[PDB]
Design a protein around this ligand. Structure first.
Ligand SMILES: [Zn+2]
Lengths: 112, 127, 143, 135, 127, 103, 78, 37
RNA sequence: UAUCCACUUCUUAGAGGGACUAUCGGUUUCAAGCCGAUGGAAGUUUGAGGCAAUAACAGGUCUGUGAUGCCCUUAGACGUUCUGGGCCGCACGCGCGCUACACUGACGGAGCCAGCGAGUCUAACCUUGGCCGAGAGGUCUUGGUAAUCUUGUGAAACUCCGUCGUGCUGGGGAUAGAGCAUUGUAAUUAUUGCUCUUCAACGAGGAAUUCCUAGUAAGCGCAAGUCAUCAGCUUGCGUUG
């Protein structure tokens, strides 16, 4: 974390903690879907997540995206997570977290 | 050869000089001690050796311990080693030195698995 | 307001006295320094093959200053060799004895360690003077 | 430290003691490619001969290769003692040797046919296993 | 007879005893200073009782810190709890009460655990 | 003039306390120099036992426990006083040991 | 002799338990209530607290010496 | 072996005691081992 | 390990305290109770197991007793010994685990933190310290019959500084050979430890499945039992969390 925050110091960025909280905000799951029974043919129901759980898989999705971007490549966890965290501070769709976020959003829009 | 040493000079020294040319297991086996019955074994071994006809095989000496280190006063002798059930008549050649006697005496017939006809035929009857 | 090794860091002190042993060179170096491994619990030789011996000497002098006296088993658990034992996992394995013996005997032969009356190896007054002196220019390298 | 780069004069694939080595990895781990020589033996062989092992094997000269080759057949004269060698106190001649890449297989075949003509349990077990899982 | 204050500090089976004396103003932990702690990132955790009240209060007091038990991080919590407890005990006994009140409000505004040890003792195995 | 160190071991604390209080109140009442009853930590002896003597169900465990307490009081007394106290103080549950030397 | 301290006390408890069970099973008809033993530096004294004592000491101490030899032979004493 | 019931199985060999466990589980209180916790 | 003095702040043996769901607010015939908040060391019954009375067990033996039913009364070894082999043998299925598939990492140096324990007599346990040996270890002595010595068990994971660059690689360590040591009367079907070499499959695992709500999962070592020698077996302890 301190090497990552040192990288976002030198990512032409003056406010790296603001990059952290804005990527937490921008990777909030706004609409999800659940698994209702429904009698065999289970359809999907539009359901919204609690803010505590929203920051839960916001943090978790950012870390697992940085982990699988940090697996089997030379580039370290700090540099991958800095790229992940600056690509999620603004909506860019080049990051795993934004991609799974609007994937679950279009799943929630397609299941109502 | 044993240590680059010609065999006919190797036939005529004593056991301590074999220990001085031995690996570590043989020296550690010698360093503690034996029981008295291999002295009778080597006595009847050389008694069967001295009654050998010339240019032929000597009398068989039926051996039973499977843990003894080979010491080459029995070069040219032939021994039958107990496996637990039967005997394997093995002659001593001077290239098997530094070895246990029980590795010349197997303990089982091997596990056969490439026989599907005998396996299929012997299943338990279901009637 | 006195200067000692108890105010300096470890790594710069070991580097400094390794450099001073390299520049002075008044020790005993046998012919198997470029042969031996540091422990049975090691697998590769040290990378600084011309200078790991003086690193070991700096280490053992720094541990003899910080306590009353040490023995060879204390140095062997102090190094703490860990074996990848093939399929079998890591354990604690005591280090090589003769490495500790030769760095100690080469260090009484020059006059920093002495044998304590309690059976161990204690720091002498010349060694206290030498380690406090090199601690003084250890402070006088970062002025 | 300092970067030192040379215009050319490095070879990609070399060959020493009738065995191929590659000149981009370090000297020790280019000498792990040959069989019968591992890591630690190659470290000891190279660190006897005052070879800098931080640099790579592409800038090895022929006078280093010849002295490494000269180390290989008789290491006992140059303070490489008995316990580092593969052939130690052999039953044939009683001396010590480090077996080479075309000699490890002759050693293994010699051990197996020696166990055959001894007719030991190890030999008949190994050849029965080879003749059964082979078929 | 130097004015001395002895106060403990405990976390996770590791107790640090802090002897707060009067002197030139000096911090040592087990014969090593506060600028050299064995974890280099928990150095600021040991620095946290210094920064939370003020750097001028330590001009007149020498603090003797000895810790045993535990591991690395538990010893860091033990020595920082011992330092905060000994500082407020010296400012209770010798210095006036309202000064110690300002120290203990400054400590509880950031770290509640600096004055009360951990209530997370290891559980029974539940046989 | 002989110095005698008396060490008392007992698993029960009530009889050990009664023995130690009787020893202290008997030693102080006829003017002998002594130390107090020095209190060693209580040894807890634990052993593990299966909940399943028979092989039915899952494997779960319990623990049997013991408590052993140790005290020792140092005395200075003549020989006859030591002999009469050693004759008097023998009680079940508390073990009394008499040490002559001080090395 | 010279047993380590916890092993000494546990083996002493086994010694109390074995004499307790042996005197429970042996003199069940002579009013057995309990036993206590005293360890002296000279010898070891067994005090039999059985409430029918005239049957415990028979003619010229025969059953007393009998139980004494039962303690002697099994428990390896001089 | 276990000198109570000729038990050749389930021995515990600690402290030179050699009782089987199935005889130790009822004679523990007479020895001194009591269930506390 | 006594130069004296003070103390138990930490360690510990105790006597007591304290908690009784205390107080408040909802809910409830507004009755016993339940839930949320504050204070509290502790406010899910703060957390855990043993103990009864009762009706049911052809369950197991006691080397218990009654001219008790059964078969021979013995050339049967169901009694003794002596050696030698095993129980580990391998197309394989199932299951419990260990190590890995890597660069939050492998290697080399330095920093270095624990606790539950345990330890020898008419024997040889835990072992300090000194010499030799690459090591395994050997050897010469000493301490502890134990909060005293091993031991502050200076444990490992970890922390830093350097090597390695994504390449079945320097990851991995299966297999195998040679030599040297230790225990055992005896080590071959290799007891175990050390040195060199061999560097096999194995690029996060399908159907399905196990365990778990706070010092808890998980990683990590250490101690105790099995012990003559080794653990990948079990129970605990401690570190990080
Ligand atoms: Zn039994």
């Amino acid at each position: 974390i301190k090497h990552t925050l040192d990288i976002i110091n030198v990512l032409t960025d003056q406010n790296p903690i603001q990059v952290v909280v804005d990527a937490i905000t921008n990777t909030g799951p706004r609409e999800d879907t659940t698994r209702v029974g429904g009698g065999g043919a289970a359809r999907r129901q539009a359901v919204d997540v609690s803010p505590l759980r929203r920051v839960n898989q916001a943090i978790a999705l950012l870390t697992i995206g940085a982990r699988e971007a940090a697996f089997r490549n030379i580039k370290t966890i700090a540099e991958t997570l800095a790229e992940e965290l600056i690509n999620a501070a603004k909506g860019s769709s080049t990051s795993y977290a934004i991609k799974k976020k609007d994937e679950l959003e279009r799943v929630a829009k397609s299941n109502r | 050869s044993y240590r680059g040493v010609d065999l006919e000079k190797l036939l005529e020294m004593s056991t301590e000089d074999f220990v001085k040319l031995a690996p570590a297991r043989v020296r550690r086996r010698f360093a503690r001690g034996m029981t008295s019955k291999p002295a009778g074994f080597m006595k009847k071994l050389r008694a069967a050796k001295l009654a050998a006809p010339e240019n032929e095989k000597p009398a068989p000496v039926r051996t039973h311990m499977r843990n003894m280190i080979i010491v080459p006063e029995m070069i040219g002798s032939v021994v039958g080693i107990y496996n637990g059930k039967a005997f394997n008549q093995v002659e001593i050649r001077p290239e098997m030195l530094g070895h246990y006697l029980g590795e010349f005496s197997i303990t089982y017939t091997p596990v056969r698995h490439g026989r599907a006809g005998a396996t299929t035929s012997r299943f338990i009857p279901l009637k | 307001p006195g200067v000692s090794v108890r105010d300096v860091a470890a790594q710069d002190f070991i580097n400094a006295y390794a450099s001073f042993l390299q520049r002075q060179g008044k020790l005993e170096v046998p012919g198997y320094v470029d042969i031996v491994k540091t422990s049975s619990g090691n697998e590769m030789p040290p990378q600084d093959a011309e200078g790991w011996f003086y690193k070991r000497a700096a280490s053992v002098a720094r541990h003899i200053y910080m306590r009353k006296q040490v023995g060879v088993g204390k140095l062997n658990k102090l190094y703490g060799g860990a074996k990848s034992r093939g399929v079998r996992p890591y354990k604690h394995i005591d280090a090589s004895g003769s490495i500790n013996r030769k760095v100690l005997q080469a260090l009484e032969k020059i006059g920093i360690v002495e044998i304590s009356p309690k059976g161990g190896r204690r720091i002498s007054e010349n060694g206290q003077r030498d380690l406090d002196r090199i601690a003084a220019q250890t402070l006088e390298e970062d002025e | 430290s300092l970067v030192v780069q040379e215009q050319g004069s490095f070879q990609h694939i070399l060959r020493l003691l009738n065995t191929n080595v590659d000149g981009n990895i370090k000297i020790v781990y280019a000498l792990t490619t040959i069989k019968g020589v591992g890591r630690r033996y190659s470290n000891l062989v190279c660190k006897k001969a005052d070879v800098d092992l931080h640099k790579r094997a592409g800038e090895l000269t022929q006078e280093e290769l010849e002295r490494i080759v000269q180390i290989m057949q008789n290491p006992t004269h140059y303070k490489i003692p008995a316990w580092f060698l593969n052939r130690q106190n052999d039953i044939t001649d009683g001396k010590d040797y480090h077996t080479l890449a075309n000699n490890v297989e002759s050693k293994l075949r010699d051990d197996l046919e020696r166990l055959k003509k001894i007719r030991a349990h190890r030999g008949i077990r190994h050849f029965w296993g080879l003749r059964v899982r082979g078929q | 007879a130097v004015p001395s204050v002895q106060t403990f500090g405990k976390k996770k089976s590791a107790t640090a005893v802090a002897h707060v004396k009067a002197g030139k103003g000096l911090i040592k932990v087990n014969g090593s200073p506060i600028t050299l702690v064995e974890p280099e990132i928990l150095r600021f955790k040991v620095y946290e009782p210094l920064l939370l009240v003020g750097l001028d209060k330590f001009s007149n007091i020498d603090i003797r810190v000895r810790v045993t038990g535990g591991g690395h991080v538990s010893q860091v919590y033990a020595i920082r709890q011992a330092i905060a407890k000994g500082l407020v005990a010296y400012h209770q006994k010798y210095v006036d009460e309202q000064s110690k009140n300002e120290l203990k409000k400054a400590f509880t505004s950031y770290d509640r655990t600096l004055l009360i040890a951990d209530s997370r003792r290891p559980e029974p195995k539940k046989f | 003039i002989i110095k005698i160190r008396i060490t008392l071991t007992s698993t029960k604390v009530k009889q050990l306390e009664n023995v130690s209080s009787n020893i202290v109140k008997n030693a102080e009442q006829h003017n002998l120099v002594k130390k107090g009853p020095v209190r060693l930590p209580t040894k807890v002896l634990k052993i593990s036992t299966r909940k399943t003597p028979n092989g039915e169900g899952s494997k779960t465990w319990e623990t049997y426990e013991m408590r052993i307490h140790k005290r020792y009081i140092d005395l200075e007394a003549p020989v006859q006083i030591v002999k009469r106290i050693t004759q008097i103080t023998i009680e079940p549950g508390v073990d009394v040991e008499v040490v002559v030397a001080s090395n | 002799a010279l047993i380590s301290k916890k092993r000494k006390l546990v083996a002493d408890g086994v010694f109390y338990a074995e004499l307790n069970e042996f005197f429970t099973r042996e003199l069940a008809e002579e009013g057995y209530s309990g036993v206590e033993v005293r360890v002296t530096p000279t010898k070891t004294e067994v005090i039999i607290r059985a409430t029918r004592t005239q049957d415990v000491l028979g003619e010229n101490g025969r059953r007393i010496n009998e139980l004494t030899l039962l303690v002697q032979k099994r428990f390896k004493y001089a | 072996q276990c000198r109570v019931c000729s038990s050749h199985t389930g021995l515990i060999r600690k402290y030179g005691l050699n009782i089987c466990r199935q005889c130790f589980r009822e004679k523990a209180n007479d020895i001194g081992f009591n269930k506390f916790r």
